[model samples]
Target: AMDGIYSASGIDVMGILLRIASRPNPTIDLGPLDCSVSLTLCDISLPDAPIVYASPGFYQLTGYSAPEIMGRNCRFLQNSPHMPPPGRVSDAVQEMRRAIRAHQEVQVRIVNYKKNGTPFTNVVTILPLWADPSGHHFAVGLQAE
Candidate 1:
């Protein structure tokens, strides 16, 4: 199996696996998606979960062009001023980290800033793609609500 996939893709075996494991599950049940939502596909296997694809709606939502977003971490949207509050240790960030490390699906709603620094509630649903040939291991978001 390893040799077959490697030969077909001309990439390393571990590279293929990491790529597959980071893809989004097409079977995700996103109920009643609307035009107001944005979708961002990420490569979690890479450093900082950089975006691989951003749907057209994502451009509308974030006001960032494709070239500006590609190869950049989704965390750039975060309003980092509150990262380590006086009494809080950023539970949401820590939880997302654990979820990614464990290859588990995680959902979190937090305040995120756009390219213009406009704050918005980001209800992000991140999931690991068990076997994707596209070379990405995870997705940044699904629905806006």
Candidate 2:
């Protein structure tokens, strides 16, 4: 009886998908996708949610080279400073934080800035990647609009 409990079987189902996402080839794998949309694999095991894999679409959308975005949290894409005052946090940001803590999926439209300082409204979807309890978890992000 599968009651949507998200068990090891679910991991098997998503294993191939996760493997493909973990290895992104901008010029080959992602060339067929919409250039304006982006995908990012975030290492949630790290304190700041550093991005481990960023697709070519990300570079196209954010004007940031992969090397520049690596080792940094996706929060940097938002216009706000990396660390906002506790009281000044926006609802969207707060929701994202809560969702991350809960290990749940999150969808939010946020104001984000490109490396060139141009602002854009980013509709972002963040999905948790949890396969093995002992293994590190990750977050898969899709950005558009």
Candidate 3:
């Protein structure tokens, strides 16, 4: 089950990647505490698909601390005030939305913001993962610059 990926405050994140990857996926970041390419995972089974796990790279990439990042939707980056109008990026956002709803994998190079509110576009890839053969649908998000 998901324990292969998450259990007791740790993630065999790479293992999860490989599992879904045999079905799809390819990335070049995230391994250990170096914060490479920022990575996070969300539970498709839960309401709003809240973040269930995040890599150390992710915490540094978002400039958001541990407590602040956990269990939150990553979309807050796009919710900052005085935005460039989600219209420009809303199409991309909508695509990702549809991807998740359809239980598919998606990659989008789109705008995102740091905790300091500085904006940057990241290559975000979302993959549908089966944490279990019969339960626990999940989505793994890999963030890159």
In model 1, how many backbone clashes occur? 6
Model 1: lowest-lDDT 10 consecutive positions? 8-17
**Residue 121 in candidate 2, Cα distance off native in Å:** 0.8
Q: Which stretches of candidate 1 lie over 4 Å from their true place?
A: 1-29, 34-36, 80-89, 134-136, 143-145
- Lowest summed lDDT across 10 adjacent residues in model 3 is found at 26-35
Which ten contiguous residues of candidate 2 have the minimum total lDDT?
A: 24-33
lDDT of 2: 0.71
TM-score of each: 0.66, 0.69, 0.79
List per-prediction Cα lDDT, in the order shown.
Answer: 0.66, 0.71, 0.75
- lDDT per residue for candidate 2 within 37-100, as digits (tens), equals 5878777888888987776778988889977888889988875344344554567887888888
lDDT of 1 by residue, 1-145 (tens): 5556534425343443345345566434445655355877777878878887776778888878999889998777765444553354357777777877887778877767677777788777776664457555665566362
Q: Which candidate should be chosen as best, given lDDT against the real structure?
A: 3
Error of 2 at 57 (Å): 0.5
Q: Using TM-score, rank the candidates from best to worst.
A: 3, 2, 1
Which of candidates 2 and 3 is the stronger one according to TM-score?
3
Q: Which scores better on TM-score, 1 or 3?
A: 3
RMSD of 3: 4.6
